Design an enzyme around this catalytic site. Structure first.
Site, PDB file in Angstrom:
ATOM      1  N   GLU A  83       0.794  -1.207   0.000  1.00 11.45           N
ATOM      2  CA  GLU A  83       0.000   0.000   0.000  1.00 11.45           C
ATOM      3  C   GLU A  83       0.832   1.265   0.000  1.00 11.45           C
ATOM      4  OE1 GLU A  83      -3.095   0.056  -0.604  1.00 11.45           O
ATOM      5  OE2 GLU A  83      -3.860  -1.934  -0.041  1.00 11.45           O
TER       6      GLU A  83
ATOM      7  N   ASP B 163      -6.166   6.258  -5.037  1.00  9.56           N
ATOM      8  CA  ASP B 163      -5.718   4.851  -5.106  1.00  9.56           C
ATOM      9  C   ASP B 163      -5.749   4.377  -6.559  1.00  9.56           C
ATOM     10  OD1 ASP B 163      -8.323   4.021  -5.647  1.00  9.56           O
ATOM     11  OD2 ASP B 163      -8.662   3.022  -3.732  1.00  9.56           O
TER      12      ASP B 163
HETATM   13 NA    NA Z   1      -2.134   2.502  -1.965  1.00 15.60          NA
END
Ligand code: NA
Ligand SMILES: [Cl-]
Ligand SMILES: [Cl-]
Ligand SMILES: [K+]
Length: 164
Positions: A11, A20
């Site tokens: 992440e 994202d």
């Molecule tokens: Na991310």
């Protein structure tokens, strides 16, 4: 390696609101704020999550706090989900991390829709499960991350993350 180190690799860490891989406003270590296209809606969600008026910016400690909440909640949720708990209970602790990773990324419903792959995992048919997991939007849209998670399910080792 552990789930926190694994998801920190997958992440990243960003202290300002970003989008994202799906284009959704996020912060920290993959903390999804909202699917709304409104930055102001995302900022509101952020302030609600942190408990102060952040104006789109948090500290590392605050990011880590949200991250621990998000992992903790992912695990509690797996255990409350009739479609996921049996497969989770059948797995070793390394493969637990692969399933938590998937739930972190796509949510419970999304992972519970992998019915056939989950059955193969429950059966410990690891190479078959790995092949089936790849037949997915997930693998097509985030192939490198999916390959790491799938290798973790296939092998029960950290080989796909040890070196990162
Ligand atoms: Na991310
Ligand atoms: Cl496909
Ligand atoms: Cl990827
Ligand atoms: K900061």
């Amino acid at each position: 390696m552990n789930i926190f180190e694994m998801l920190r690799i997958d992440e990243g860490l960003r202290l300002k609101i970003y989008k994202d891989t799906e284009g959704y406003y996020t912060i920290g270590i993959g903390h999804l704020l909202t699917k709304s296209p409104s930055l102001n809606a995302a900022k509101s969600e952020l302030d609600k999550a942190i408990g102060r008026n952040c104006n789109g910016v948090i500290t590392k400690d605050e990011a880590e706090k949200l991250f621990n909440q998000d992992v903790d909640a992912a695990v509690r949720g797996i255990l409350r989900n009739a479609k996921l708990k049996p497969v989770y209970d059948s797995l070793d602790a390394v493969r637990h991390c692969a399933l938590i990773n998937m739930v972190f990324q796509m949510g419970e419903t999304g992972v519970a829709g992998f019915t056939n792959s989950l059955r193969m995992l429950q059966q410990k048919r690891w190479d078959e499960a790995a092949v089936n997991l790849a037949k997915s939007r997930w693998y097509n849209q985030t192939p490198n991350r999916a390959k790491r998670v799938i290798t973790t399910f296939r092998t029960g080792t950290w080989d796909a993350y040890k070196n990162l």
